Amino acid sequence: CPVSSYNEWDPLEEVIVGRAENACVPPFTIEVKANTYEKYWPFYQKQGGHYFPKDHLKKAVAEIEEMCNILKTEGVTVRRPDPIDWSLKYKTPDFESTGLYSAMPRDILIVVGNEIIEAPMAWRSRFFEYRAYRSIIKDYFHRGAKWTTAPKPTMADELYNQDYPIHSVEDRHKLAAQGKFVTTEFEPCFDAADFIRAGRDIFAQRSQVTNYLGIEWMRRHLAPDYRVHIISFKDPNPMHIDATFNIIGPGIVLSNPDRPCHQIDLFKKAGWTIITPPTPIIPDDHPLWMSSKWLSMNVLMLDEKRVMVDANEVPIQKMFEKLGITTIKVNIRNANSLGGGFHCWTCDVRRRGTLQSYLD
Amino acid sequence: CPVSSYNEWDPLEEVIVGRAENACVPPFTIEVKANTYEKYWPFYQKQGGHYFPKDHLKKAVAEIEEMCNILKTEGVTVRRPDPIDWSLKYKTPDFESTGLYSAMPRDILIVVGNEIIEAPMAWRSRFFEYRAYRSIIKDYFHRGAKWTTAPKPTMADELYNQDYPIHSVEDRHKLAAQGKFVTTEFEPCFDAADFIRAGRDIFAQRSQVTNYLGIEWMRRHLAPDYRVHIISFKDPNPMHIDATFNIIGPGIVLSNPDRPCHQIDLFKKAGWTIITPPTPIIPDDHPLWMSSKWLSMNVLMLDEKRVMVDANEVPIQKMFEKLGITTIKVNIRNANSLGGGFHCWTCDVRRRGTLQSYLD
Predict the structure, then answer these.
(1) Is A268 an interface residue toward B (CB < 8 Å)?
(2) Which of B134, B114, B130 is nearest to B192 (CA)?
(3) Which parts of the sequence carry N6-acetyllysine (chains A, B)?
(4) Which candidate, A268, A272, A248, A266, places its Cα nearest to that of A343?
């Protein structure tokens, strides 16, 4: 079986790396608005449906090709999704929309053991995103891997709170604190990136795109072998957990200083080392259409002592170095604009290791 | 100035608490052999250079995190050293070695007034230990504190008696009595924990790691404001004074019954209350790689009437209680294995009080 990964750190052998080609600006609908900084709302309002700036995409393609070269150098087998034009307008009986991209495999695929799981997603523009990854998945399936697709939502109006009172990121943080998100509990929905793996224990956060029904589905589907825990944070990211609580080793986690975890004591009690990374140094003028500046901690571990970290972020590089972790510096400053760092731009398919508990 | 501590008992306000992360078993060299029980010599011989048992370290991390929680509860500001991988092999022109840990701030930092002093150390594996504390110290310095580093030894062969005829702890006690230690008087060397503070009078013991040149340096450096006295004991601990003669208040001291002080009468004449604690109850099967079972009396005073004492050591708890001293029980049974109790795992940076004499 070519598929086999129980955590985020065991020696990496095979990975799927995303594509920047033909990425499209999603139409400005409520769920897009609730997952982006106000600074860019007018960009979405105007550019929605068109491709992301092509000169910018071109630099990202180059950055990602180099990253793939380095992965091969580091002994990792790299697979890439199929090229697709994401501008095609599709129409289900519930809605009509254009696509986004297949830049982030971590948003849609999660590997638990020998099982590859396709997340349902929660954005109308990401409904048919799975199409880019099917060739790779069918191959793993032919070769023995288990293949699962969580229930694809209808994404009917009922899934969204069309009147979500958000006018600034400050409002959303407040609502998020009151348990109010743009997604209702009408049906299961979630992005795989809201889940982070540590062997028998998987951690999830209810976010703007991952509801409790979505987490319960995962929980029910993986029990009894795996345990899915729900954790929360202060001023959380609207979507995705990997630049907020990145588990980098057995009992070691990077905790974003701006998004403290409410359940941090569960981890201190388990004897876990909580490391808080230094601040990012990325220029405020550099466009980050999605995500925040914290992509610096969105690292990918090649193994426990080897991390792929952004070439520009010297301060977090030094941190890893004083920790005895070898830094493989790669520059993906332009790829970052699409919404992700090393962890998001990949999906670890096979890591050499076994299923263990680290929470004891 | 955030730094200000003249003794071991005034109301505690700020403290630095050590780290168990990445601790490494020191290579088995002569000075390590002379500072440990024969029972563990083969452990050092085999494990030297590798990390201390990780499952054990994990329990210690948890115990220390809880201790920090309680300190914050008791109103104390807690600082922690930087995480560092102690397995890195460094090489000076005199020797080559791997590190130990930054578990015991008391071994390397001593605060006298508004001055923070970095001890030179005497173990080759603790040469670059100061690196974990530099961020904290530079901060205190920016904020007005005096900062001093005693002369870092070369730790060349000349500092050690490579042929120190020790085969059992019984031999070392005999040699110690003859004035023979593993460290020569080739150059100054010392651990800060061999010094204990009582306002204008500081007490030191020449031990396996603190030589007369080291004590004289302290004496000469602090005169005339402070007076450094040398005291001795029967069957002394190879290193550190804080589990042999722990001064817990103005004119009150805990005197280890197994290590009577030769100069006890100087204290009786001063009108000091010498208390001899009851015996420890720690199981003989529990590993104590460094130190002895007497860690029970290695208490830390939050103030004159509040002591942080081990949760398991009920007998010494009762003693403090009949004395009217409130006991704050914390369990650090696994942290103890690293070589220290509450006093060793901390360094009091600021205690509310003034410089006084208690020996009159």
Answers:
(1) yes
(2) B130
(3) 322
(4) A248
